[PDB]
N, CA, C and O of each residue as an XYZ file, in Angstrom:
56
protein
N       0.041      4.931     -1.760
C       1.527      6.032     -2.859
C       0.715      5.583     -4.270
O       0.122      4.512     -4.398
N       0.796      6.406     -5.076
C       0.319      6.567     -6.443
C       2.024      6.345     -6.932
O       2.119      7.551     -7.163
N       2.830      6.044     -7.130
C       3.684      5.690     -7.898
C       5.031      5.029     -7.487
O       6.200      5.400     -7.593
N       4.225      3.505     -6.795
C       4.950      2.317     -6.262
C       5.050      1.540     -7.688
O       4.093      1.243     -8.403
N       6.485      1.267     -7.950
C       7.086      1.096     -9.262
C       8.922      0.611     -9.402
O       9.849      1.409     -9.545
N       9.040     -1.049     -9.299
C      10.357     -1.056     -9.579
C      11.415     -0.536     -8.178
O      12.429      0.162     -8.154
N      10.877     -1.022     -7.423
C      11.107     -0.670     -5.569
C      12.167     -0.896     -4.923
O      12.133     -1.180     -3.726
N      13.341     -0.803     -5.650
C      14.792     -1.537     -5.612
C      15.217     -1.012     -3.976
O      14.911      0.040     -3.414
N      16.117     -2.292     -3.417
C      16.432     -1.576     -2.047
C      17.905     -0.685     -2.354
O      19.024     -1.183     -2.222
N      17.662      0.605     -2.752
C      18.983      0.964     -2.265
C      19.359      1.771     -1.480
O      19.797      2.910     -1.643
N      19.203      1.221     -0.666
C      19.471      1.262      0.737
C      19.093      0.125      1.717
O      17.927     -0.152      1.996
N      20.391     -0.634      2.313
C      19.973     -1.987      3.067
C      19.522     -1.752      4.499
O      19.950     -2.570      5.313
N      18.479     -0.466      5.102
C      17.970     -0.115      6.314
C      16.503      0.309      6.405
O      15.849      0.745      7.353
N      15.994     -0.109      4.363
C      14.839      0.594      4.205
C      13.890     -0.532      3.763
O      12.710     -0.283      3.515
């Protein structure tokens, strides 16, 4: 990935 930044859990299945 080239835009991995602040990966919040906006889905509790990923």
